[PDB]
């Protein structure tokens, strides 16, 4: 019954959310190098549930369109990753009836993780090269059940990150798409009837990232 509404017309790429994901779960940092981008880590991994993707797009006149994409599992209303794993060992991937969270369990070490990733139209699942566990955003289902905002949402200072009941979050996305279209005429909602993380893009979702939308 819960939805994130992520208004990318408000993102400063401050990367609060990225750090706050790790601090809450006490995840480790990757070995990183600068390869000619601010972006880092360069991709999701077993230890990185969220990264902010930076894309520079040319525009006529001064400046650029600098597209910011803080990427996480979309918590699909119809989880393709479950469907894929449920026919190898049922229970490795679960849906919380309460929140709508899609959660990967310890039993994902006993499936074709690799083929659970392929089923994911958003290329989200990541594999531990040791335990063969699958990791991804778990919606801070911990905190939500206790009636806390997820860490990435409470930390965001711009109004980009928003969370709550589907009805209220859909209503808000609807209303906010209308106001944002005044500044960014080509603004669209990502897969807004399929997912529980509804991104507002300022333009073609595919400019933000190859797998932004299904």
């Amino acid at each position: 019954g819960k939805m994130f509404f992520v208004d990318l017309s408000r993102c400063t790429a401050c990367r609060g959310c990225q750090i706050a994901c790790k601090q809450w779960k006490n995840l480790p940092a990757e070995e990183t190098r600068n390869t000619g981008s601010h972006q880092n880590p360069p991709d999701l991994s077993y230890v990185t549930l969220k990264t902010v993707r930076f894309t520079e797009k040319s525009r006529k006149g001064p400046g650029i369109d600098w597209l910011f994409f803080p990427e996480q599992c979309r918590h699909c209303v119809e989880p393709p990753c479950k469907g894929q794993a449920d026919v190898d060992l049922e229970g490795a991937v679960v849906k919380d009836e309460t929140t709508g969270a899609v959660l990967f369990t310890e039993l994902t070490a006993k499936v074709d993780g690799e083929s659970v990733r392929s089923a994911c139209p958003y290329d989200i699942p990541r594999i531990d090269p040791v335990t063969k566990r699958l990791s991804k955003c778990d919606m801070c289902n911990d905190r939500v059940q206790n009636g806390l905002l997820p860490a990435c949402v409470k930390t965001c200072p711009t109004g980009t990150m928003n969370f709550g009941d589907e009805q209220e979050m859909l209503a808000l996305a609807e209303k906010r798409l209308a106001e944002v279209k005044k500044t960014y005429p080509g603004a669209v909602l990502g897969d807004p009837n399929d997912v529980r993380v509804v991104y507002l893009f300022t333009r073609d979702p595919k400019d933000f990232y190859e797998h932004a939308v299904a």
Binding site: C14, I19, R33, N34, S37, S58, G63, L148
Partner: protein, 956 residues
């Protein structure tokens, strides 16, 4: 229940990074008895509302960090390793080196035979990162030992702001506060990258846009800030005064000024003396010999009372407004567009968007920091913006102000405690050698014969006396005045500041340096000169969280420990969440934070380190005697400690101050020992003490107002976000400074939907009124001698009006506004170095990176030093995105990853393309691996020139 937090005590804290002052919640193991288990944002905090940028968000990893110092370390002369040692060893041995150097070097009288009672063989750096009580105690310790070379961050950050805004409005501080940004109708961010460098500010800037504001970024680079602004406008480095000059001409030409505001509240109507002139780039009173001006030549024509003359009709051609109209007529769009490299169309759009706030019921604000303060312009640059804000009636109003964004969490407070060489706490000047008595000191304060000019600084004698009583409660103030050291009257005031301390150090004219919560081996410009220069110290005290490029300069790049004879003590201080006290944010909000965990290992609060160190100096003097001991013996440290440790609470109460006796003041009776309720009840006669008159009203009999966490608001308060019951700001909880200017002469707001104050049933309602008195009875700028917002500023070295003098020496050969190219009050420009280097910040790192280079999540995001270049300079030098590059200059060279980006574009200067290359100064050699060294290997030390310096860039 969340298992992570279930058995942890929860306390509130305040971010230990930038001056937004974000609220934290800390969770400490064993209900207080263990380590911190969690740090995230405080959801009830009215500034951040629970949100944190990645610096605040990662504070858990800063605190619970296994790379942190555990115990003092000792480095022996010519040694090549540390030896771990006791507190008692390092402190007693330190107390010795202090007494040795002092007794040896202490001077009772200068060459001229004037009493000075000081030592010039010890200098101190730091710090804007200690608590306010630690800053205030630190300062008073350094001054009892007779130091004059006392400095911190503030001098490079915002030393142009304090005089520019003090000249303009009568105070140096940010005029409004962070929440008030949401009330603006137009937001101009110029010389600031606030979305990266004050990230939670963008909560309020974007709420301003939600309510119909235009957001404007004027920057030579396209940033994370630019991406969320309505207007991005590029400006070549140092062309800001031409830009603000055009805007001033645009506002006058188009009659967009707020006429009544200008007539009544600015000096628009004052008549300037006939001695005032400007021609071909030089004001009158110029002396070409000394490259200096005779400011007397600029004075106002006075009436026979001593009061400057006024033509309220604004007709007299020597009216300020008429002289201003005349001065800025040379700043037309063609000249301005040519030099800024901003199109005429874009200048017109920005000018129209911003001058529209000239409307009484519209407010525009400027946000700036180091893009302005670290250029040569700087002061005249900030003066221009202040003058625009007075023309538009933007000062004193909700959504208006000059929002000078302070840097470090307590740089406002460290400045307020006088951790610069020219000021005591409360901005009372350090007496010079000619100020031979307290009476003389007090005689220097200018007076006004205008019955409508409040002229508040005339109360200075009460503040200075109350101060001397706080340090020396058993001495008469006039006697206490001889204990504290004085600077030479005959001497350039800058000869005591940061840049000169490094010059003096490199000529070995210092024995001892305190590097207290600063990392100069990375922070100071021309790092290679400084790293060498620090070798010529006899001893070094570094107080920090982690071992660093300063503590360990002696084993740095191309340094041989054996050669290097400097004795180094390394004292590990605790993190913000491990101690109690207050930090003062940019908004002047003085906010109380609490201990979460106990100090890691054997680390101590700075308050315990420096107090104990001084106790070891005191008893060393008491057993051995030595140079003029009274100032050290007599100092009242009893009031600073409780249960054998530094007491934040006690120190705070002394800073507020209390009655030393039964006293009647302002027709109230007060009992001995009662806390002073406000600076309005301080006395010059020794009835009262107060370590800082600004703090008077902060910790009253009512309690510690800095620790309030009350969101109660009247409709009018809540409409503009004053939050008067959340914590306390100086002076006396006046959230928006100069708010008397926000109302007409009947006491009605210019913009009733956003009133700051309003006159209702014989009283001011809303904010605390900035100066008592009925509507229309007082000039609104009460710290000003004359009472007015100054368009014309006859106390400024470069002239009473900002004028464009080219900051960029090398690539610019002619001035479109005069025949004075450069500033009439030495850069080689070697052609081997054809590009303009600039240094600046990213969201993820902090200052030299001493702190953030030790947090794995911050290195993860930003692991290495990078060099940002245009596609044009990439194509020209044959550099690919991600290639390793060598950036070099006369001062040094380094390696960096190329970020080729359209976010940089070449400047168009005098027919030719000039390429600008950008570096972060977040990197140093200690940590992490492959991270890189400071960008300050490249910068010169000629407040230094870090935003424009000549480099070459080559592929490796």
């Amino acid at each position: 229940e969340l298992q992570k937090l279930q058995w942890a005590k929860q306390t509130t804290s305040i971010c230990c990074y930038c001056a937004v002052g974000c609220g934290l919640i800390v969770h400490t193991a064993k209900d207080g008895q263990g380590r911190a288990v969690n740090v995230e944002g405080d959801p009830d905090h009215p500034i951040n509302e629970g949100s944190l940028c990645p610096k605040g968000a990662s504070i858990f990893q800063l605190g619970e960090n296994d790379q942190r110092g555990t115990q003092p370390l000792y480095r022996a002369p010519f040694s090549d390793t540390w030896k771990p040692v006791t507190w008692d060893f390092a402190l007693t041995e330190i107390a010795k080196r202090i007494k040795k150097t002092r007794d040896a070097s202490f001077t009772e009288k200068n060459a001229a035979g004037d009493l000075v009672n000081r030592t010039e063989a010890i200098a101190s750096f730091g710090s804007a990162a200690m608590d306010n009580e630690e800053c205030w105690a630190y300062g008073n310790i350094l001054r009892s030992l007779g130091l004059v070379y006392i400095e911190h961050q503030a001098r490079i950050x915002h030393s142009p702001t304090v005089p520019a805004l003090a000249e303009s409005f009568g105070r140096g501080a940010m005029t409004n506060h962070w929440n008030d940004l949401a009330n603006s109708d137009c937001i101009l961010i110029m010389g600031s990258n606030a979305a990266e460098n004050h990230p939670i500010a963008f909560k309020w800037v974007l709420r301003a846009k939600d309510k119909g504001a235009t957001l404007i970024h004027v920057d030579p680079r396209f940033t994370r800030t630019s991406a969320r602004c309505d207007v991005y406008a590029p400006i070549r480095s140092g062309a800001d005064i031409p830009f603000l000059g055009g805007l001033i001409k645009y506002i006058l030409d188009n009659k967009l000024y707020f006429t009544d505001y200008v007539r009544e509240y600015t000096n628009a109507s004052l008549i300037v003396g006939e001695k005032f002139s400007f021609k071909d780039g030089l004001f009158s009173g110029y002396d070409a010999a000394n490259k200096k001006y005779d400011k007397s030549m600029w004075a106002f024509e006075l009436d026979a009372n001593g009061v400057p003359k006024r033509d309220p009709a604004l007709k007299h051609p020597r009216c300020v407004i008429n002289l201003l109209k005349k001065h800025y007529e040379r700043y037309n769009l063609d000249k301005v567009a040519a030099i800024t490299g901003t199109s005429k169309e874009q200048l017109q759009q920005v000018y129209k968007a911003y001058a529209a706030t000239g409307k009484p019921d519209k407010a525009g604000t400027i946000m700036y920091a180091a893009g302005w303060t670290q250029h040569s312009v700087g002061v005249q640059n900030i003066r221009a913006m202040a003058m625009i804000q007075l023309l538009l009636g933007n000062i004193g109003v909700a959504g208006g102000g000059v929002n000078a964004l302070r840097g470090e969490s307590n740089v406002q407070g460290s400045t307020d405690q006088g951790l610069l060489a020219h000021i005591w706490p409360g901005y009372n000047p350090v007496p010079n050698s000619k100020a031979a008595t307290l009476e003389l000191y007090n005689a220097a304060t200018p007076q006004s014969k205008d019955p409508m000019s409040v002229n508040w600084w005339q109360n200075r004698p009460k503040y200075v006396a109350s101060y001397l009583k706080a340090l020396y409660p058993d001495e008469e103030p006039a006697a206490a005045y001889d204990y504290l050291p004085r600077i030479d009257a005959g001497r350039k005031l800058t000869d005591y500041f940061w840049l000169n301390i490094f010059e003096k150090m490199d000529k070995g004219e210092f024995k001892g340096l305190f590097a207290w919560g600063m990392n100069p081996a990375c922070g100071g410009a021309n790092a290679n000169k400084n790293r060498k220069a620090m070798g010529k110290l006899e001893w070094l005290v570094n107080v920090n969280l982690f071992e660093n490029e300063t503590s360990s300069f002696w084993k740095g790049p191309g340094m041989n420990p054996a050669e290097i004879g400097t004795e180094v003590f390394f004292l590990p201080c605790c993190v913000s969440i491990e101690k109690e006290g207050s930090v003062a944010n940019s908004g002047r909000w003085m906010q109380w934070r609490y201990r979460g965990p106990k100090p890691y290992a054997e680390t101590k609060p700075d308050g315990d380190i420096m107090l104990d160190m001084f106790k070891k100096v005191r008893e060393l003097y008491a057993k051995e005697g030595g140079a003029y001991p009274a100032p050290i013996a007599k100092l009242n440290i009893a009031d600073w400690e409780e249960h054998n440790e530094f007491s934040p609470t006690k120190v705070a109460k002394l800073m507020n101050g209390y009655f030393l006796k039964d006293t009647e003041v302002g027709g109230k009776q007060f009992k001995k020992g009662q806390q002073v309720p406000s600076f309005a009840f301080l006395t010059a006669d020794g009835s009262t003490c107060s370590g800082n008159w600004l703090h008077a009203g902060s910790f009253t009999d009512a309690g510690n107002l800095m620790a309030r966490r009350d969101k109660t608001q009247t409709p009018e308060q809540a409409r503009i976000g004053l939050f008067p019951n959340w914590s306390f700001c100086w002076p006396v909880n006046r959230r928006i400074l100069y708010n008397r200017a926000s109302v007409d002469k009947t006491g009605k707001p210019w913009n009733p939907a956003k009133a700051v104050i309003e006159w209702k049933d014989g009283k001011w309602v809303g904010d605390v009124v900035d100066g008592g008195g009925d509507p229309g009875t007082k000039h609104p700028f009460i710290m000003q001698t004359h009472g007015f917002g100054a368009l014309y500023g006859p106390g400024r070295e470069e002239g009473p009006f900002p004028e464009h003098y080219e900051p960029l020496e090398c690539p610019v050969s002619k001035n479109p506004f005069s025949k004075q190219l450069h500033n009439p009050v030495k850069a080689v420009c070697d052609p081997r170095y054809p590009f303009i280097g600039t240094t600046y910040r990213v969201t993820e790192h902090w200052q030299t990176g001493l702190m953030t280079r030790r947090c794995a999540w911050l290195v993860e995001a930003e692991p290495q030093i990078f060099c940002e270049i245009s596609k044009e300079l990439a194509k020209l030098r044959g550099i690919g995105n991600g290639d390793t590059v060598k950036v070099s200059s006369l001062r040094g060279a380094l390696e960096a990853v190329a970020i080729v980006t359209e976010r940089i574009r070449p400047f168009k200067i005098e027919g030719v393309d000039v390429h600008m290359v950008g570096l972060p100064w977040h990197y140093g050699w200690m940590v992490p691996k492959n991270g890189g060294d400071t960008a300050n290997l490249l910068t010169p030390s000629a407040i230094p020139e870090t935003k424009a310096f000549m480099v070459d860039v080559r592929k490796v």
